[PDB]
Design a protein around this ligand. Structure first.
Ligand SMILES: [K+]
Ligand SMILES: [K+]
Ligand SMILES: [Mg+2]
Ligand SMILES: [Mg+2]
Ligand SMILES: [Mg+2]
Ligand SMILES: [Mg+2]
Ligand SMILES: [Mg+2]
Ligand SMILES: [Mg+2]
Ligand SMILES: [Mg+2]
Ligand SMILES: [Mg+2]
Ligand SMILES: [Mg+2]
Ligand SMILES: [Mg+2]
Lengths: 48, 54, 112, 231, 39
RNA sequence: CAGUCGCGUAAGCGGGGCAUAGGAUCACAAGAUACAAAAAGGAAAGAUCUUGGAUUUUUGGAAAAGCUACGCUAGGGAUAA
RNA sequence: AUUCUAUGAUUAGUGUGAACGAAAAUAGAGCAGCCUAUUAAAAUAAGUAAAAUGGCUUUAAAGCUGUUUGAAUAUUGUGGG
């Protein structure tokens, strides 16, 4: 209940995602990850 | 004269095939706007970012 | 990558290497040893610089001009296979994998 | 009753090992990694090369450490003298090189184009020296604008190009990897690179400061002409 | 069926229905060969 | 090894944490894959890959309270009168 | 056309599981067609087909069914699968 599992959706609209955990009483996650569909580092943002 | 493959008929196509040209464009339109989205994300910062998918 | 070491060695005062004894040292010497070479002419290393060189697109053509042999030779990493002797498979499913237990192949075949 | 952890030595001295073989499982570094050895996340020591395990002490490296190594010759003894040449093995096999040659075909077995490419369309002497300074700056400023305009033409053509390639089921679509390389070549993430230069920013800051100060000069001088008429 | 018709409609397999195609036509009953050019 | 990113003058390091304490399948749900599509064109329901919700805590994974001095049968006598 | 035997088939499939389990087709035994039925029957079928719901059978189809409702009229493409 204290920790939630979020989904970091790629901003290349390729449908790839990364799942990381973070506390509810925190800000949304945002990272620069490697999208294997386009094979390039793009911006991944939390789903909601 | 059966559906699709008969004389004077056109194969409908599977949905993945029908939405293929509109699917590759969404990826192409997004990648072209990728450099401008990372510049706005590194300038605004990870904490002050307020745009997220829905 | 290959290391090419550029060495600068000082000769002792009034010691001039014979122009014909220097071109004889490299004769029939395919493993040039700086240690031995230095000890024979009584030289001393003073300066040094380094620069490496690996296989690149222009390597093949450079060998053609000067006739350097060895272009059509590629090196592959030596592979070490396990030294464990083969062993019979163990498990309930692994035993019952031959045509004998054809009636139990629904528990043994196509396992994820 | 717990599951045993089975810590300790997995290879004794002079025992043959190949790369990756565990030699010693430990909680903390009871034995530090030495010659031709690797330490894992949990401090497990593995051979990096084929050879024979050797337990020794290196007083030159650390006064109170004990190491595990791997020697290519069973008769060798560690620690090797710091002044002796490194003993290393080639570890390669000689094979004939490839005869690859650019033979890209144009049509498939069915007679269809392998790739279809589509493009888009849309102060006496100082003044002389200062002039040489201004000209050089103005010349580069013209060259920079004469080349930045060129880059905006290659990017427009590249980002506008569409290479449709034959895939399975006789379909024609753009590959996803090529779509990724439209914005730029791999090696850096476009957008992270700083578009501007710090030196250029300083130059702009001064120019803005000059016009501001010089602006007051013109306004102050202008006010003086209005005052003269009043008087 | 679609797949069966397409297999014997292309000259790559020497299908006996390949004579029904034009040189620029594709075997697939749904997909078409895009045109190369700038327009 | 391939892909492509960070740090570093460089060498290079990086597939989380100094080490040792967080369970599958099935079902269900969200993405991708383009495999098959029960006459045929689609679809539904399936298949592969990634991921999520479990005191599945009897943690190789049942939805589960007692009495019989009226007790029954098959056994052992791990000592029970 | 039906019936009987084997193969198809520890198959497709169903089911958490344990298990359950077709059809097409093939071979053999028999063979037979009709409404003017070789023993006397239809003016071609309406509360029917079907739908909702409760059950049966079952793979979700087809089939059987209580309750409440409720169609169309032949390849000049009406109706079932
Ligand atoms: K089955
Ligand atoms: K039914
Ligand atoms: Mg179908
Ligand atoms: Mg059907
Ligand atoms: Mg247990
Ligand atoms: Mg266990
Ligand atoms: Mg006893
Ligand atoms: Mg049968
Ligand atoms: Mg009738
Ligand atoms: Mg009915
Ligand atoms: Mg129906
Ligand atoms: Mg019916």
């Amino acid at each position: 209940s204290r920790i939630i599992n979020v989904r970091l959706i790629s901003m290349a609209m390729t449908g790839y995602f990364y799942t990381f955990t973070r506390p509810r009483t925190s800000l949304p996650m945002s990272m620069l990850k490697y999208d294997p569909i386009v094979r390039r580092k793009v911006l991944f943002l939390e789903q909601k | 004269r059966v559906k699709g493959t008969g004389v004077g008929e056109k194969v409908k196509g599977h949905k993945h095939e029908r939405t293929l040209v509109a699917k590759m464009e969404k990826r192409r339109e997004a990648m072209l706007a990728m450099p401008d989205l990372i510049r706005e994300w590194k300038k605004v910062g990870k904490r002050n970012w307020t745009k997220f998918p829905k | 990558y290959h290391r090419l070491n550029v060495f600068v060695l000082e000769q002792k005062p009034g010691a001039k290497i014979d122009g014909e004894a220097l071109k004889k040292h490299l004769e029939n010497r395919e493993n040039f040893s700086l240690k031995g070479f230095r000890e024979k002419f009584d030289l001393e290393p003073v300066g040094f610089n380094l620069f490496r060189s690996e296989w690149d697109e222009g390597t093949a053509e450079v060998m053609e001009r000067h006739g350097i042999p060895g272009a059509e030779v590629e090196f592959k990493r030596q592979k070490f296979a396990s030294l464990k002797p083969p062993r019979k498979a163990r498990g309930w499913e692994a035993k019952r994998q031959k045509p004998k237990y054809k009636s139990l192949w629904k528990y043994v075949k196509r396992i994820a | 009753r717990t599951i045993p952890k089975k810590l300790g030595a997995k290879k004794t001295g002079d025992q043959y090992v190949i790369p990756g073989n565990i030699i010693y499982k430990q909680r903390g570094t009871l034995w530090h990694p030495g010659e031709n050895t690797i330490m894992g996340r949990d401090h497990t020591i593995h051979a990096a090369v084929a050879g024979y395990v050797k337990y020794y002490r290196d007083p030159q490296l650390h006064p109170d450490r004990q190491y595990i190594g791997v020697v290519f010759n069973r008769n060798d003894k560690l620690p090797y003298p710091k002044d002796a040449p490194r003993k290393r093995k080639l570890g390669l096999v000689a094979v004939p090189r490839k005869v690859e040659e650019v033979e890209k075909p144009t049509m498939s077995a069915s007679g269809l184009p392998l790739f279809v490419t589509r493009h888009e369309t849309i102060s006496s002497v100082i003044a002389e020296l200062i002039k040489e300074k201004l000209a050089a700056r103005a010349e580069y400023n013209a060259r920079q604008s004469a080349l930045r305009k060129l880059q905006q033409q290659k990017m427009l053509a590249r980002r506008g190009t569409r290479v449709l390639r034959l895939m399975n089921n006789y379909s024609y679509r753009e590959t996803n990897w090529e779509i990724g390389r439209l914005i730029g070549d791999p090696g850096s993430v476009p957008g992270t690179e700083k578009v501007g230069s710090r030196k250029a920013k300083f130059r702009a800051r001064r120019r803005r400061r000059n016009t501001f100060l010089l602006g007051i000069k013109e306004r102050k001088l202008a006010k003086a002409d209005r005052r003269e008429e009043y008087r | 069926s679609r797949w069966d018709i397409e297999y014997y409609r292309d000259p790559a397999h020497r299908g006996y229905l390949s004579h029904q195609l034009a040189p620029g036509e594709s075997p697939s009953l749904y997909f078409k060969v895009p045109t190369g050019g700038e327009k």
